[PDB]
């Protein structure tokens, strides 16, 4: 009855090759750079203000970057008769990509002043004093190095761990388990790296607030999900990515606090005396980056972008294209000194105030290939089908109404000092995802239309060969 | 004849492929115990952590239930229909990062890499609270029949000393089944603790009470027919971090010939148990061995990705996704001068992975040697086909009506016995269906067309 | 692997006088050899 | 497409279009190079 089997819904999915066409023309945008300071551990603001003195940045905060495009179906080819703008449409594909990155290489590092811990759990050679009430401490640690890369017209999609509604049988008494569920979530910039501690809010499930370092606490950490990513229909999320990672144990310690649920006395034998009392159970892991080496590095190399896992290959529709890149190697924090007073020979701690800077360096520079689209009536459909809103900046224009038309719009003229209602002419905004904020760059003015003259490019020739572009 | 034959002898291969696959998995437990109420038997947590092993048993529907666009390449008389698995593959979606674990009373003398003085001698309960990683350890098995594990254990003593209390149990090497929640070898080799370990405290609390078991690849690989395991990876990794003392009446003395005679402190012998504290190294992105397509074309058995009964193992283990989230709750929130006394901690701890599947379909033709073959290698397959008939009994019955009407014919309905089909019933252990799942194309889906991609022949409709 | 046996079952409080330790070791060998066969042709200078 | 529309005949070239390369090779070198001094401060 369920599954004996002649059901045929779906339409298939296509790969995008199978459509576009590519042309014979290649061009070149880039930036000059882009670099940009913080401070590390928490962004600085006014004391009584809410306005920010100083952006939070660091290298452990993730980077996005959006990349606008100039519509190609306006832009003048030295020869543009080989298409007609009627039947047809220009898409720009994206060939290959890099990432500059100029810092000197080298590790930065976080802590806590105040940070829950019993004591060394790595040796004893006695069993641990009572709990006091506030045993909390200075201590840091370095986080796990990470090295990654994503392409793609969608949004690269996260995830992590947070706390959802309780299944309403059992009322929660203060301090009982706040657990746990999965949620995806578009990605944000300056959101945090895991740390090895998972991605999660520790805002909503830890209230101690000092369970870790002050970077993560307020922040939700989050990491990609390739899983859901890759899987999508068209691959449109990422079609390329690259990653690196490594960790290793250093430290072991316990929380320090009451105990939420008691060890089952039968996994053990009970003490006395001084072991009458169970020490804390909770260990908690301390993790440690490795050597980092100029091997590794996944950047200042150039990419080919050919075939992908989905079936968009490197097209971009809506002139729209995003990176995603988050590195530890360069988290080098500067530290300074500045001098209150000058006079004084005598060395005195309370003469200097201690400030730290960071920097943050980025580069970017893009192949790009020229597509057509041919329309047709399974064309149309298809795209229509994908994402309409994509057609939207074409000409539909519009589709045009087999939408629906507005029905005349009221204008009435009055000096708004009559009572009649307000009006306010409308209609700016373009971003559906404008709520999600990140950073931004611009290219449209920068294309050219030759390699020659670009570092980057003439690999692409020399790849490819054909050296000059019109010679065979 | 005697002797089993390459499977790929009488199996004929297909031109179909299909493909279906779970949507994910996702797992929250605490990794040390498992909860429950106090006075109830009944788990209020279920107790979860990577170490657990992982075991996922997986339906497929009879094919020859399946109807196909064209069903005509077959006879369904003379034939049958069974899966072959072509390629697997195993998704890991959670950050990788270790956890850990330890023991509040751990048995320990003192610490013995460095001593500038003899030791103190051994009180009553010296056992402290210390933890340590376990070893990094990735691996992979697949194939129809259940992973045959093994372990140490204690087996009967000979009777012929009587057995005094605090003798030396002997050992026994013992397989079994291998079931889901079960531990990886700490390092501490595979046994019951539980049995042997009267102290309790001598490991860390996740391992105490379970038997820690481990993979024997040459009793496994030496199945006639293989259908074990067709295939596998695996890899580890260990170094030493500590030397520590077991702490206890001594069982065995040294014989004194190999040392000479000390005096004052000197004069008693330390506690010659030594113990190593093993540690897990730098993990990598590179060794990962999930996330990556698998081609299984020969295996070493003789079963080449025959899956018998409809039914196919995937058995995983993995310590690097073991991270364990820690969170605090606020009993109050008033106070701003902290106290320890104001917070309850918990451990709840993540697990995912995810599964796709390719398939390769095959039709067996019959013969006698055919028949019995199969049926010499399990009859049981037999009965969920429609071959083996066993004529039926039964002349006369006599129905009395009614029964409830108490005028007495006798007492009566006794045949409930057979429903009972998994004779492995008893073991419990994790379980997904797939049933509904299959598709036919593998173009709409990630994995698939890599597959279309590493042989070739890429066919799609025009657009 | 170690071990540790109970003389005394009875007393919950832990006593390090109860326990007896003892030390094990396990070894897990196996072979499979291939062979070939030979044959020798003989004469003086062989045999010598 | 604001800027590409004009150009100009620009491109600065390939130093192998104009350069040619002759059949001869030689050679020199230091004998060697040694140096001394404190590693902190002079």
Redesign the interface.
């Known amino acids: 009855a369920?599954?004996?089997?002649?059901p045929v819904p779906?339409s298939?999915?296509?790969?995008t090759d199978?459509?576009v066409a590519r042309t014979n023309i290649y061009y070149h945008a880039g930036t000059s750079r882009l670099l940009a300071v913080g401070h590390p551990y928490f962004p600085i603001k006014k004391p009584n203000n809410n306005k920010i003195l100083v952006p939070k940045v660091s290298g452990l905060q993730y980077r996005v970057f959006r990349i606008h495009l100039?519509?190609p179906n306006?832009?003048?080819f030295?020869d543009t008769s080989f298409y007609n703008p009627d039947t047809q449409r220009l898409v720009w594909a994206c060939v290959g990509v890099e990432v500059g990155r100029g810092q000197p290489l080298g590790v930065g590092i976080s802590g806590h002043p105040?940070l829950?811990k019993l004591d060394d759990?790595?040796?004893?050679?006695?069993?641990?004093a009572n709990?006091?009430?506030?045993?909390?401490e200075c201590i840091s640690m370095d986080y796990?190095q990470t090295q990654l890369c994503l392409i793609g017209c969608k949004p690269p999609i996260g995830?992590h761990?947070g706390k959802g509604s309780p299944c309403t049988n059992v009322a929660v008494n203060?301090?009982?388990?706040?657990?746990?569920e999965?949620i995806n979530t578009v990605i944000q910039d300056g959101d945090m790296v895991?740390t090895?501690?998972?991605?999660?809010d520790?805002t909503t499930?830890?209230?101690?607030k000092?369970?870790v370092p002050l970077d993560i606490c307020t922040s939700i950490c989050k990491?990609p999900?390739?899983?859901?990513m890759?899987?999508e229909?068209y691959?449109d999320s990422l079609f390329f990515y690259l990653?690196?990672?490594?960790?290793?144990?250093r430290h072991?310690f316990?929380?320090?606090?009451?105990?939420?649920?008691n060890?089952?006395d039968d996994?053990?034998?009970?003490?006395?005396?001084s072991?009458a009392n169970?020490?804390?159970?909770?260990?908690?892991?301390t993790?440690s980056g490795?050597m980092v080496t100029s091997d590794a590095q996944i950047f200042n190399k150039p990419y080919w972008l050919q075939?992908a896992?989905?079936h968009n290959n490197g097209i971009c529709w809506g002139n729209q294209l995003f990176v995603t890149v988050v590195d530890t190697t360069r988290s080098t924090n500067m530290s300074l000194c500045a001098a209150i007073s000058t006079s004084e020979t005598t060395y005195k701690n309370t003469n200097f105030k201690e400030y730290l800077r960071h920097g943050e360096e980025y580069d970017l520079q893009f192949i790009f290939q020229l597509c057509k689209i041919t329309l047709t009536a399974?064309?149309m459909t298809?795209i229509h089908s994908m994402n309409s809103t994509i057609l939207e900046d074409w000409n539909f224009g519009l589709q045009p109404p087999p939408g629906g038309t507005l029905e005349d719009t009221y204008r009435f003229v009055t000096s708004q000092a009559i009572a009649c209602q307000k009006h306010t002419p409308p209609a700016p905004k373009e971003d559906p995802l404008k709520k999600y904020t990140f950073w931004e760059v611009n290219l449209k003015?920068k294309?050219?239309?030759?390699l020659?003259?670009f570092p980057l490019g003439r690999k692409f020739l020399l790849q490819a060969g054909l050296?000059a572009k019109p010679k065979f």
């Open positions: 369920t599954v004996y089997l002649p779906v298939k999915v296509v790969s199978e459509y100039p519509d306006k832009f003048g030295p105040l829950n759990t790595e040796n004893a050679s006695a069993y641990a709990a006091g009430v506030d045993n909390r796990k995830e761990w203060p301090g009982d388990c706040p657990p746990l999965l895991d090895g501690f998972g991605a999660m520790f499930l830890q209230a101690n000092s369970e990491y999900d390739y899983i859901k890759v899987s229909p691959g990653r690196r990672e490594q960790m290793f144990v072991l316990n929380r320090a606090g009451a105990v939420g649920e060890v089952p996994l053990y034998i009970k003490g006395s005396g072991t169970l020490a804390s159970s909770n260990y908690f892991p993790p490795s075939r896992q989905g399974d064309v298809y003015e294309f050219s239309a030759d020659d003259q050296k």
